[PDB]
Design a protein around this ligand. Structure first.
Ligand SMILES: [Zn+2]
Ligand SMILES: [Zn+2]
Ligand SMILES: [Zn+2]
Ligand SMILES: [Zn+2]
Lengths: 234, 234, 234, 234
DNA sequence: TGAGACTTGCCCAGACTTGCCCGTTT
DNA sequence: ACGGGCAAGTCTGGGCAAGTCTCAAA
């Protein structure tokens, strides 16, 4: 039990936001991103490239923090950590504590915090400008546990919160995306995108006894507008 | 020995009311809320989130009171406790009295009051201002005792009054909503919303073709919301 | 967790065994017995007459003990007691401890034991000869909890072990019968006897490949034996 | 490779051997034994009864010890213990070390040993004679892990060894059986006997028709049991 | 190295269970 | 005093979930 950190998108004064467009080779050979679900599908310990976008350059000392929380409300108050099994392993490069789920790769300037009040785990790195020629900064993450790990996430969906903060920790920007660490990213992505499709492309009409004339016309109208936009695979 | 607290629709000075995240009606769905009923169906021990909305932020310290008492008048003056089976059953938290129905997990500034004289269990938390970007406040409850339990609510309906206090605990806000804790929120929600519509179905009601199952739930999530106003001022 | 007491029928040197043939009025107005299931169906706290049969008269000091254990193997090691709710009640005539499920009625010579090693509950009464004219002794029992009581038996089927022991406690005879304490004995009995019928009204066939002439002979003969018993009662 | 406990069946001077109960191939059947494979299919932490048969009463102070080892030769030298997850969890039982895989229910005289040399785990209990009227004594075990727990048995098959030792620890008897702790005993069993049933099937087989699914499976059991004795006895 | 073909843990909707009220029966 | 019609809790097995094995084709 611990207070739940906000997950509301907030572009802030710098128009902070994330992107997931990276070469499908040597970087995406494992993981795949679903725009429709805003969910990343990656294997255990495999690198996940995330792009940081910002309109103007942040003040000196700005950092980028990554944190994980459970998506479902009945679990939002439970800290996200590694399972007993994976926790005890040499997989730790020394820098990252064995109990942290999220790891930053390719950056020795990373810093892992184990909040003394919320007991929440997070990893932080100094904000760095985009490479000349590009308009985004790249950050490489690694997830050290399967979403299914018993004792750990235990088949519970998680959400990664990326926050842009000043030297003092004050919020400057915040974005997020769902994550499922599994053994078959490609497969699982199809299944989920397929289930999403059905929930959308459903052909079972229904009825409702609306009241009044105006309110009646509201739905009746806003409905003919949507029932028209259905023309997508036409 | 004492009396029962009121529950008049008291918005307040700013604009204090409660909101509930729309839940998809199922069978064993952990939790769901009925708009046209103002009733919250939910299994026990399963965290339930309740939204806090308000215009201008009240004066610092102004806490938010949450209490629950039997719906019907016949037992309205009876203390709401748990069954002897659940009494023994200890909880992860000791900061919350065992014979307590309502709870507030993920918080530390929450007070699980226990009024001896009036004999009315309750709980209060310091109204937290909406996070930078966040448009409202959230609080998590965990009703620790079913309604059908023998030796407790014993099938007897309940209710939960969320009132806004102040430095001492006077008046500044008021809200309410029925709370039936069971093992089938979805199943029970149909049998009730349906049995409701089986009452006075005549008048201005015209048929309206609605495609899509989910989209069908959407059109009702609003038609009923507006239909509430047709009762709000009754 | 406690060692499981034997439940194997043992007529012993006295041909000890039970019978359940009692007037359907003032004695069976509540409970009913199923020969096909060897299961008694009785309401909470209602008297249940059981007949003790014996070929020759037992030595001086013989007693009759009644004990309850769970029928299903996964529960056999758990002591059978009353639920928290019913446990706390004036229903106790003083003689019988509030935690005992089984009670002997109409006999102030009864004695309730709460085993110091197995923690098992039981009630004992001195063996008494049959009434002149009859060839059986009657004993009246009372069950203080529904089979469904949560915290108690919790919908788990139980089995009552009646043992005939000498003054020292040594086993002389043992018999048993299943018991379901419910609110509608008649109803429940029909349902269960009806389900039993279907299971035996099964008329699907299967072929078996037996290896070895003498084996087939033995297997065949056995199957015929059952084939006949199928005609014996149709 | 330094020390592996024998698994050679040895009836000994007292004709020691085990027996089990007849279970149905349910879906989530708590426990079920397969005479065809001499393997027990049981759910995590659910009671498993094992019948102890003896031709003659063993000397005073005789004990029974259960120990688990891996069945596959390449793992025989690896101690069988609980996995990191389940290990870090104190169950209602406090007599058994948290790392031991096998536990004994309802017996406060059980003693758990951690061998100082072999480092193997084992639980021991006093041998008790059969209760008057019975032909065997019975022990109730519990397996605190799934055959598939990662960091534990890791989908590796285990063999449970029951030895009958004298007051000095000398061998008096030994029998054994395979164990699979899983979520669906019935299912997993039906599958194994299946693949087994489609193997070695040559010779002259007499055919016999049986009516009713229950009857058939009883016959099929006994027959599959004899086909096991035939095999190993050349 | 990409995905069928397993292996193996769990969800979950349609029963099924079961205490209780109620009007009618003997 | 026995069924019928509810109120709720829980069981059940088909289906889905999700890691691992393996074999042929880049
Ligand atoms: Zn893990
Ligand atoms: Zn309760
Ligand atoms: Zn009870
Ligand atoms: Zn385990």
């Amino acid at each position: 039990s611990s207070s739940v950190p906000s997950q509301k998108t907030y572009q802030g004064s710098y128009g902070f936001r994330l992107g997931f467009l990276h070469s499908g080779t040597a970087k995406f050979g494992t993981c795949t991103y679903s725009p429709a679900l805003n969910k990343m599908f990656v294997q255990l310990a495999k690198t996940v490239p995330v792009q940081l976008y910002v309109d103007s350059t942040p003040p000196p000392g700005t950092r980028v923090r990554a944190m994980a929380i459970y998506k479902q409300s009945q679990h939002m108050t439970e800290v996200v950590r590694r399972c007993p099994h994976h926790e005890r392993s040499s997989d730790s490069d020394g820098l990252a504590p064995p109990q942290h789920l999220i790891r930053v790769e390719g950056n020795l300037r990373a810093e892992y915090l184990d909040d003394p009040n919320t007991f929440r785990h997070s990893v932080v790195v100094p904000y760095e400008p985009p490479e000349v020629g590009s308009d985004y900064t790249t950050i490489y993450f690694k997830f050290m546990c399967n979403s299914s790990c018993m004792g750990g996430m235990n088949r519970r969906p998680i959400l990664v919160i990326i926050t842009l903060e000043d030297s003092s920790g004050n919020l400057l920007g915040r974005d997020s995306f769902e994550v499922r660490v599994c053994a078959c990213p490609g497969r699982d992505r199809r299944t989920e995108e397929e289930n999403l499709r059905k929930k959308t492309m459903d052909g079972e009409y229904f009825t409702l006894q609306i009241r009044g004339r105006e309110r009646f016309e509201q739905f009746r109208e806003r409905n003919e507008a949507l029932e028209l936009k259905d023309a997508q695979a036409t």
